[PDB]
Each structure stands twice: as C-alpha cells, then as structure tokens.
C-alpha cells in the first residue's frame, strides 16, 4: 500500500548523515528495528550480499524498499495477532490479565495453576504493570 511504502520511506529520513537516502548496512539494522523488526546478524548479511552486490554497501530507497518487499509477506499476520489479543481481553479494558489468560487456557484444554499463570504474565509483561497491553502482546508474539 502507499502507506506500506510511506512508512519505510518515512523512517529512512531519521538516520542518514548522507542526505542522499543512501545509508550503510551499519544502520540497516538500526532502521529495520526502529520500524518494528528484529533481524539476526546472519540475515542482515546474506541479504545485503545478493541484492546489494553493488560492492559499495550504500543502501537507498529502491534497495531498502525492495528488501522489505519480501519480509512483510507472512509476518503481516499482525491482523490476526491484534484479533487474538482481543480474544484474551474478556473485559475489554485493553489489557490481558492473568485471570483472563487462565480462561483462554483452561478452555483450550491446558489446565494451569494460578502459579504458572502469573508466571506467564510476568514473562510477557515488559513495564511491570502486572498486565499485558497490545504493544507487549505484540513483542511477545513477534520478538
């Protein structure tokens, strides 16, 4: 979508001390991450070698755009994830609580102890509110 591209091209202007929209593979990871992705050092390499066989290491929009123009194929499931969050959030407060997690679980056959439950919440919880908001639910599901 115009935005799909609008977003990538949007981040590009945040970290280039070049001005020609031609960043290095040094910041390629910096961008892919500030944009909601956590690539492994191995991946940042095997890719920047095939497509960018230029021999310079400078990546611009056409190059970066085309790269992202692959990843966002199966990962885009964000939709289902967001819908999933809503399944857990039985009271519609916008957060997933242990109690609620218990329900989704005990109903899907996995009887859990109030012990293990509060354990899962604290795992996924990131700012320690004792609950999981969508942003967190997202990390815990993507990250």
């Amino acid at each position: 979508t115009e935005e799909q591209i609008a977003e990538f091209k949007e981040a590009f202007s945040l970290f280039d001390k070049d001005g020609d929209g031609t960043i290095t593979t040094k910041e390629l990871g910096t961008v892919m991450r500030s944009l909601g992705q956590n690539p492994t050092e191995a991946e940042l390499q095997d890719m920047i070698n095939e497509v960018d066989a230029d021999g310079n290491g400078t990546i611009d929009f056409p190059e970066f755009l085309t790269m992202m123009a692959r990843k966002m194929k199966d990962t885009d499931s964000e939709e289902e994830i967001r819908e999933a969050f809503r399944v857990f959030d039985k009271d519609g407060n916008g957060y997933i609580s242990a109690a609620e997690l218990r329900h989704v679980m005990t109903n899907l056959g996995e009887k859990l102890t109030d012990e293990e439950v509060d354990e899962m919440i604290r795992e996924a919880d990131i700012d320690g509110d004792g609950q999981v908001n969508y942003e967190e639910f997202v990390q815990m599901m993507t990250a």
Partner: protein, 485 residues
C-alpha cells in the same frame, strides 16, 4: 437488561424460513456456537421455502421487495429494492451485466413467470392485485396493479410471463421510457436449465466457544506446544495455534474469505436444511459479513441463535454491539469484528463504528516505535530526532523479562521520561507542521499518563525537575534511582 426481541416475534422479523431456523437451533447447540444472520428479504422467505435457488457471491444484484418481481433478483435493478436510487441502480445493473458475461453459461437471465400460487401469496402480502383483462396483438393479459407510480405491469395468460412498461409522462431513474416488455430475472444454470434466483441467508457473524475450536487443533501440534519448558515461547506458540485454527481466514473461490471451521459450519448448516426438505441446494453460500471489508453493510437488526437454540433479534446496531459484548467476546467464545470498522471502508467509503478495547487503552499506553513512525507516515498526508523512535523501542524491550517488577517499573519510568524529553525539545524547535505539533502534545500526554501510572503502581511534573538532559550517559539515570526512594 437490554431491549431485544425473542422467540416467535424475533424469528418473524428475521426473514428466515421457520423450518430452517429450527434446524439451525440444532447445529447451534451441537457445536456450541452463536449464529448471527443479516436481515433476509421477507418477500423471499416463501420463495426460499418453495425451494427457489438462492444466490452466491457471483451475483450481486439486489432482490426486489415490491411489485410482481418481489423476492427475485431483477435484471433491471430499478425493479429492485434499490428502486429510485439512481446511483445504486447503476452499480446494480453493472453488477448483473457482469454476472451475465464474466460467468457466461453459469449465470443468465430469464422471463419472470408468476404461477397461480405466487400471485395469491402476493395478493395476501398486499403487494400486487390481479386486475382487469386486456388483449394485445391477439394475446390475453391481466393487468397487475401496484402502488408504484413509475411502472405498470401485466401478466400473460398463456405462459404467465409478466411484463412491464413505463407510465405516460413518467421517466425511469435512468431517464428512460419504453413500452411493453418482459421482466427479466437473474438465473443460474442447473443441469443445463436456467432457474430463477432469490435472496440467500447471509451470516453476519459466527462465534464458536474456544473449546469448540480446540477440537480443530491437531492433538499433537498442541501437546508439542503445551509441553515447552520456556513459557515465553509457550504462550506465543499457543496464541499461534489459536490464530492458525480459529482466527486466520483465507480467500476461497466462491465462498469468499472464510476460515476452515467456518467452511464446516457452512456445510453443516446447508446439510441441516437439506434434511428438512429444501431442494434448492445451498441456502448459505459464503463466509460472514465480518470479512466483507471493501463494502461493509450495516444492518439495524441481526437475528441471533445462541448455543441454547434460543432466538434473539437485536433492534439496533448499538444493541447488536452490547449483545456481542455481554454474551460473546465476554464469555469465552471466538470472535473477531470486521477490520474495516472504525475506518473508512475503501469500497463504499462506509464508516461503521465498533467498540475496540485496544483503543480505550491507547490513551494510557505509550506507543511502540513503529506506531510512532507509522503515525508519521499517515500523518504525512496533509503535507531530525530518531532518538525518540529508539527510546520507544527501548521502553518495549523484551530483554526485560530478566528483571524484577520493581526493576521493570523503574527503568521504564525512566526510558519514558527519556522520550518525553526528546519530544519536548523537538516542540521547543519550530512548529514545523502546525498540527504535527498536536501529535506530540498528545504523545507527551500519553507518556505522562503511562509514567504517572507506573509510579503509582509503586510509590509527574514534580519528579520531572530533579533530572538531567545536559550531557549524557549514565549520570542522569543515577540521580533518578534516588528520586524514587
């Protein structure tokens, strides 16, 4: 309590054939799943019952609800229920036009034939009255009157073919005029013969209980997950099982976009009515309305069948949302609402609202880094600190699951004020985009609530004084630690 119809009265308002709805009580109960339908043309009910074939997604012209052609899908959409609405008639006609060509051989059109019985069912419903006789070029016709003022109808004595013509002085919505001519209706092919179509049953939604979805997961893919030492990979792997076997939907050739449990539910439902006698084939022909994202309709009354086999009928949208809130998304059932809601559908520009819990929370939860960027993307329509887009990526760092809650709240209340600082001096620059200025005064508001929230969980402007923004490193974070004490 909430004002909703029940039993008989509700079924009555639904439009479904009584026998059929009863057969549906069964499946609801068996599969323990809520079945929600969209309004069904009330003049279509007897046609459906008499076994007239219903219509698939390959046919988009609307049905009529007046005149001799009530219940059928008229080729000429100005005879449909969208009568008079020039723009709608046109999309209607273009739709039929396409149906006839883009599916040549599968969908066609034929003359309307009103049998002796339908004429009376129509006479009862007070839709048309069999009038006086008339002869033309040696043929016997009986007029058919209707309180319509643009058209005039007559039926043939020989083959019972109904015809129509514009009235003297009157003009079609498309500004036309013409004299006598058969009324054509959308038909489908069935064993080499063309058979008339009528409304079908459109599911508004389907809500199955989690348990019922479990039965959809392979007892091996699940055990494998359930049986994982690390919980962080346990949850995700469970949630992914929920997504895969209950949420995820995919496009099908003629059944449009639906999941697999939906396909089965579909089959079950059609089977149920076939068992009662319906000989027209399928009565449900595609996925649900929650997947109709381009052209989302919005009905005032939804007909519900709960796992108990009880008939309910909401009186209005707001009500429909309460019924789903209090008995479905709130009582352990799988539900997802149309992705177009709360947005401007692209197809018909519809803007249907729905209650989204994630948004009510938005106000107190700071944004992810992407949301920040993505909001600079779409914000960049009506129209250099990346520190903030990093800090926000820091606040939501998964490598936090190794600290105590206390630790978590601490470092986050910090990472927040951090970005709340950068946003601060950006607004301290030039008001570049007059309204970009709002997005930040806004974020700042969110950042504020989140922080002032994490603090009260343990012990804003106050503490936002005894902190550094000068030079840089693990020097500010220091004075901080103590402030909390």
């Amino acid at each position: 309590r909430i004002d909703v119809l029940k039993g008989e009265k509700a079924l009555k308002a639904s439009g479904l054939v009584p026998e059929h709805a009863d057969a549906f009580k069964k499946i609801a109960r068996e599969l323990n799943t809520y079945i929600l339908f969209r309004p069904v043309n009330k003049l279509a009910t007897n046609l459906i019952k008499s076994g007239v074939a219903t219509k698939g997604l390959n046919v988009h012209g609307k049905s009529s609800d007046w005149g001799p052609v009530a219940g059928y899908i008229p080729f000429d959409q100005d005879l449909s229920k969208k009568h008079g609405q020039q723009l709608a008639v046109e999309k209607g006609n273009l739709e039929n036009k396409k149906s006839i060509t883009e599916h040549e051989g599968e969908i066609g059109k034929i003359p309307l034939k009103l049998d002796h019985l339908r004429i009376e069912e129509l006479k009862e419903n007070g839709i048309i009255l069999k009038g006086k006789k008339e002869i033309d070029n040696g043929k016997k016709y009986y007029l058919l009157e209707s309180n319509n003022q643009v058209y005039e109808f007559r039926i043939s004595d020989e083959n019972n073919e109904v015809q129509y013509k514009t009235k003297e002085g009157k003009i079609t919505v498309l500004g036309e005029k013409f004299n006598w001519r058969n009324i054509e209706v959308m038909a489908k092919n069935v064993e080499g013969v063309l058979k008339p179509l009528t409304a079908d049953y459109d599911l508004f939604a389907l809500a199955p209980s989690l348990t019922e979805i479990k039965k959809q997961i392979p007892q091996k893919e699940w055990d494998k997950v359930v049986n994982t030492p690390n919980s962080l990979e346990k949850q995700k792997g469970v949630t992914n099982l929920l997504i895969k076997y209950g949420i995820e939907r995919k496009p099908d050739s003629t059944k449009g976009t639906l999941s697999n449990w939906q396909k089965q539910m579909l089959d079950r439902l059609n089977e149920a009515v076939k068992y009662t006698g319906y000989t027209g084939g399928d009565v449900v022909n595609h996925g649900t309305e929650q997947d109709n994202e381009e052209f989302p309709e919005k009905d005032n009354e939804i007909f519900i069948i709960n796992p108990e086999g009880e008939f309910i009928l909401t009186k209005n949208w707001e009500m429909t949302g309460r019924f789903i809130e209090k008995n479905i998304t709130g009582k352990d059932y799988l539900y997802y609402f149309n992705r177009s809601y709360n947005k401007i559908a692209p197809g018909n520009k519809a803007y249907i609202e729905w209650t989204d819990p994630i948004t009510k929370a938005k106000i107190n939860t700071i944004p992810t880094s992407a949301e920040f960027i993505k909001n600079l993307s779409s914000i960049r329509r009506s129209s250099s600190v990346k520190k903030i887009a990093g800090y926000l990526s820091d606040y939501y760092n998964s490598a936090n699951h190794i600290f105590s809650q206390e630790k978590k709240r601490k470092i986050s209340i910090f990472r927040g004020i951090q970005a709340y600082n950068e946003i601060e001096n950006v607004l301290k620059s030039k008001q570049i985009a007059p309204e970009y200025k709002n997005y930040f005064q806004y974020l700042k508001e969110r950042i504020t609530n989140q922080v002032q929230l994490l603090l009260t969980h343990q012990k804003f402007k106050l503490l936002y004084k005894q902190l550094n923004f000068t030079e840089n490193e693990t020097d500010n974070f220091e004075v901080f630690q103590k402030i909390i004490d």
